[PDB]
Design a binder for this molecule. Sequence first.
Ligand SMILES: *[C@@H]1O[C@H](CO)[C@@H](O)[C@H](O)[C@H]1NC(C)=O
Ligand SMILES: O=C(O)COCc1ccccc1
Length: 340
Amino acid sequence: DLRLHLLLNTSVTCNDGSPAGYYLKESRGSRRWLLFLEGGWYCFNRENCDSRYDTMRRLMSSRDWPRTRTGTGILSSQPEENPYWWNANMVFIPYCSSDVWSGASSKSEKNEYAFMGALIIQEVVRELLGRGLSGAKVLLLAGSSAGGTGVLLNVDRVAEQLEKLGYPAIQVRGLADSGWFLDNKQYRTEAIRRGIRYWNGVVPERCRRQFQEGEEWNCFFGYKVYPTLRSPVFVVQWLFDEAQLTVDNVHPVQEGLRLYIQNLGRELRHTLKDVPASFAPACLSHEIIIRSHWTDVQVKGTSLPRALHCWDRSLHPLKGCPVHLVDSCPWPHCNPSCPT
Ligand SMILES: *[C@@H]1O[C@H](CO)[C@@H](O)[C@H](O)[C@H]1NC(C)=O
Ligand SMILES: O=C(O)COCc1ccccc1
């Protein structure tokens, strides 16, 4: 069980002005810290956010959060469930800002909602330094879905924050799960561009300087933001991610749809060619790395917990310990280990 702590700086808030927070389980024999960003889409205008407040309120407010949560998958403390980092200090950061972790805008007379995702991450890091993070050797910022994109948007800012605060020995790394999307044509980006204006959203500085004003939405797409990042980042992405297919309007397959799906997998595989640490199975799935059976999938005979361990070793090619694992087969479930 991870225990809830509401932020001591109560001006760093969820959408409705209630305090943001984090769930923590300490492991005093470990200098490894895992900070995980929850996902859950986003909202981009007043009417769309009002609808989310009616039926997805835990994603907009801390008022109903439970006192504890169980760590599962990569957040589990049991070696059988988590062969990678079972002994680490574990942190789960709830997603209550609806801004893909990019916002830095408070509620005010002109703003019905606060969008503070980028500031929530910074404040969690600051408050953890007094609970043991000051002694860390590695801080892994991980996340799933919208939280995976959040990793790409925030990992370099966390590294800079710790350097400026005076902690140069902490190695900051990222793990982005299910947050690597393509701005492709549908089978049958406007919302993100509108969202960024609504949230006062911020993107990493080098990417911002490449794309310039009005074009910062480009930095929400992994293949465009990844090459600009300085921190090491491991990318996990299904070749046929269900959220990608939903936005593409894909739900006895005829030739046009067969070609569309095959081209999507080939494009995803191409964007990962120059990503040295990656795990990309040929599956149609919405499943994420905090599920209890995350150990089950393999690419070329290697599981994700093994690949992450090999990544740790590489940051000290390795014989029999690979880190770049991308399926080449062209149709969903051509990998026999895909989630069922
Ligand atoms: C609380 O957070 C806000 C927003 O990041 C910041 O402006 C303020 O300085 C913080 N307060 C303290 C005491 O650190
Ligand atoms: O969570 C989702 O599946 C989609 O929303 C987040 C997003 C991330 C990147 C680009 C656009 C949107």
